[PDB]
Amino acid sequence: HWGYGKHNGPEHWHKDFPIAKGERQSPVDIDTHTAKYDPSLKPLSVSYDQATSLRILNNGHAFNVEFDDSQDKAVLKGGPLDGTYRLIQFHFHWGSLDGQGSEHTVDKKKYAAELHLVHWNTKYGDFGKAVQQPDGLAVLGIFLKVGSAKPGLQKVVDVLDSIKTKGKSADFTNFDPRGLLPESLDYWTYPGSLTTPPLLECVTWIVLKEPISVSSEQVLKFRKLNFNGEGEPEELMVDNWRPAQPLKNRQIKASFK
Numbered sequence: 001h002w003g004y005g006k007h008n009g010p011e012h013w014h015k016d017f018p019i020a021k022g023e024r025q026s027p028v029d030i031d032t033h034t035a036k037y038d039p040s041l042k043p044l045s046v047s048y049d050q051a052t053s054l055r056i057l058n059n060g061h062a063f064n065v066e067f068d069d070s071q072d073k074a075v076l077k078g079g080p081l082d083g084t085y086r087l088i089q090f091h092f093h094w095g096s097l098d099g100q101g102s103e104h105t106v107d108k109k110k111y112a113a114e115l116h117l118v119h120w121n122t123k124y125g126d127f128g129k130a131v132q133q134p135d136g137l138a139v140l141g142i143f144l145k146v147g148s149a150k151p152g153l154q155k156v157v158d159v160l161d162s163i164k165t166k167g168k169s170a171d172f173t174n175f176d177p178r179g180l181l182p183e184s185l186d187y188w189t190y191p192g193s194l195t196t197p198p199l200l201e202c203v204t205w206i207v208l209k210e211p212i213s214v215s216s217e218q219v220l221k222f223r224k225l226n227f228n229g230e231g232e233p234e235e236l237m238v239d240n241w242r243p244a245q246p247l248k249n250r251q252i253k254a255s256f257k
């Protein structure tokens with residue numbers, strides 16, 4: 001199956017997922033000079049006060065922090081979005097070295113990692129139906145750069161030892177995702193896709209301009225995870241990012257002037 005290596009990585013995905021060569025694939029490079037302020041964007045509302053985290057899972061590609069999405073609790077509204085999008089999970093993409101790891105790039109610059117908070121449009125009832133819709137998902141993307149530690153990330157870092165290998169999970173209740181945000185909600189937005197198979201073209205991307213800082217020690221612990229399962233040869237979970245894809249017939253809009 002698919003992965004990030006030479007023999008199963010992004011350059012191979014199109015053979016089983018032909019939409020990999022589609023018209024609205026993600027990530028993209030964000031050319032900041034060409035992105036245009038859009039006065040039609042409404043204020044963005046990130047409402048995570050009642051979020052209910054449940055579990056953290058090593059799925060063999062990254063680790064996912066999962067939320068209870070059975071009611072309107074943690075939601076994203078406003079900005080480019082029509083209606084209410086409910087938080088279901090977050091995960092990261094990161095590099096083997098601090099100079100790469102992000103999926104989106106900013107004027108071609110790669111960050112050390114990228115956080116994706118994944119939400120589905122409640123008008124479609126369930127995540128599975130939402131991924132059959134052009135406006136089914138909204139992903140809030142946040143860049144990570146290496147500098148000072150991010151206190152709200154440390155609980156994640158410290159549980160990774162217990163989910164080292166593919167298929168391992170651990171309880172992860174009472175985690176507040178508000179601690180992963182930067183100060184500013186300035187953002188860029190464009191229509192795109194999932195960045196892993198099945199690469200479905202369902203996503204409104206909202207990429208924050210301000211990165212968060214994490215410490216070298218924090219990201220080094222991400223890099224100690226394993227792609228492999230328990231009892232199998234160790235393959236460090238690094239470089240689990242898809243490179244930028246063609247922009248095609250799209251425009252990136254900015255929330256700021």
Ligand SMILES: CCCc1ccc(S(N)(=O)=O)cc1
Nearest residue numbers: 116118139193194195196198
């Ligand atoms: C079942 C699909 C799950 C899924 C794949 C990829 C992403 S991402 N990297 O945020 O575009 C989010 C959800």
Ligand SMILES: OC[C@H]1O[C@@H](O)[C@H](O)[C@@H](O)[C@@H]1O
Nearest residue numbers: 036037038039250251252253
């Ligand atoms: O025709 C003019 C329009 O062109 C579009 O491509 C831009 O997104 C709009 O901001 C602009 O007003």
Ligand SMILES: [Zn+2]
Nearest residue numbers: 091093116195
């Ligand atoms: Zn992602």
